[PDB]
Design a protein around this ligand. Structure first.
Ligand SMILES: Nc1ncnc2c1ncn2[C@@H]1O[C@H](COP(=O)(O)OP(=O)(O)OP(=O)(O)O)[C@@H](O)[C@H]1O
Ligand SMILES: [Ca+2]
Length: 360
């Protein structure tokens, strides 16, 4: 009899049990409404008559009635369990407003009746999941990208940087640039493909101009995508121009620093004496860091921004895509964290605003 690990993100919900090694339920973060309640895998397939809402916008929860239902679906239909038997580890976005974790507790203890619960910070977790308690996580999902300096399991609120460049925009950026090539992707079923192509084929060029150079001069970097109907689509320098946006947001007419500088900028915002620790412990997580090349490119780029002498180390746990979860599975499982929850009876005594003093 162990705990529960529910990680909620802008596009996917990752659910399972503390003391496992991998989520058991994984399903998009979508609630479907007929212009009578559909969540999960189910929800996607029905779209044509329904309306789809995503209640997690940019890592933060904006609809609470839809959020409640994703969790109704998670416990009952996906995990087949019932909450008032289990303690729940719930995850939160770096710099989640005070109010939102409060409101989160309410739902759990009140609607769901958890005997115990918790909210931890996603970044923080993935940092654990590799085995460290100091560092800076580049976490970057379907909707939002954070750089998060962590010191002794304590994220540093002054040093966090959020950038809303992430999966969905890359998906959108591949569409845009494949469409400039002639192709067309109207429908959302076609869109589901560009999503696949991005994940199947894209990578991160080491040297962006040389690469663009190479692909104008020959076709050595081309790959074909055979569409489920039979038609094969040639994809070329699109393959690395999509994830290039991460390093240069301009591609998307954004005036933002790329994930590299953003990470430099976050390291730089900290007390000087910790930086070398962070520099050398920089963890990728989120599924938008899955592109091959990323590590090196990031190694190359921070090294051009960092002290000439300095030692860098980008860590890319092969697993990273579902690391946030995992990281908490570890935690909720740890016999030494067993007596750190907020309990049903503890809530009753203090209301939601206790979720702060006990969740630092
Ligand atoms: N192998 C891959 N290569 C590149 N991108 C990928 C890969 N696998 C998944 N992605 C992208 O990762 C995204 C999902 O990542 P993650 O699971 O961190 O999302 P999330 O937690 O829903 O997002 P957020 O942190 O933005 O709330 C999707 O945009 C998907 O297209
Ligand atoms: Ca996420």
């Amino acid at each position: 009899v162990a705990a529960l690990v529910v990680d909620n993100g802008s596009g996917m919900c990752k659910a399972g049990f503390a003391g496992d090694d991998a989520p058991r339920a994984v399903f998009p973060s979508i609630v479907g409404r007929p212009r009578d309640s559909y969540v999960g895998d189910e929800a996607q397939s029905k779209r044509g008559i329904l309306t789809l809402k995503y209640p997690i916008e940019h890592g933060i929860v904006t609809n609470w009635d839809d959020m409640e239902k994703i969790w109704h679906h998670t416990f009952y239909n996906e995990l087949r369990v019932a909450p008032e038997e289990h303690p729940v580890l719930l995850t939160e976005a770096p710099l989640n407003p005070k109010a939102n974790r409060e409101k989160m507790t309410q739902i759990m203890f009140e609607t769901f009746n958890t005997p115990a619960m918790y909210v931890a910070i996603q970044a923080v977790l993935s940092l654990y999941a590799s085995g460290r308690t100091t560092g800076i996580v580049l976490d970057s999902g379907d909707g939002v990208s954070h750089t998060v300096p962590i010191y002794e399991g304590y994220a540093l609120p002054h040093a966090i940087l959020r950038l809303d460049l992430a999966g969905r925009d890359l998906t959108d950026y591949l569409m845009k640039i494949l469409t400039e090539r002639g192709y067309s992707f109207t429908t959302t079923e076609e869109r589901e493909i560009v999503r696949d192509i991005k994940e199947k084929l894209c990578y991160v060029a080491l040297d962006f101009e040389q690469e663009m150079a190479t692909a104008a001069s020959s076709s050595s970097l081309e790959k074909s995508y055979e569409l489920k109907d039979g038609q094969v689509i040639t994809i070329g320098n699109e393959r690395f121009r999509c994830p290039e946006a991460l390093f240069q947001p301009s591609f998307l007419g954004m005036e933002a620093c790329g994930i590299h500088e953003t990470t430099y900028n976050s390291i730089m915002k900290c007390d000087v004496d910790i930086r070398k620790d962070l520099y050398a412990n920089t963890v990728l997580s989120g599924g938008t860091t899955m592109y091959p090349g990323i590590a090196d490119r990031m190694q190359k780029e921070i090294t051009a921004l960092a002290p000439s002498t300095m030692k860098i180390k980008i860590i890319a746990p092969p697993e990273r895509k579902y690391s946030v979860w995992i990281g908490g599975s570890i935690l909720a499982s740890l016999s030494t964290f067993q007596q750190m929850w907020i309990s049903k009876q503890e809530y009753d005594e203090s209301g939601p605003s206790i979720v702060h003093r006990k969740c630092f």
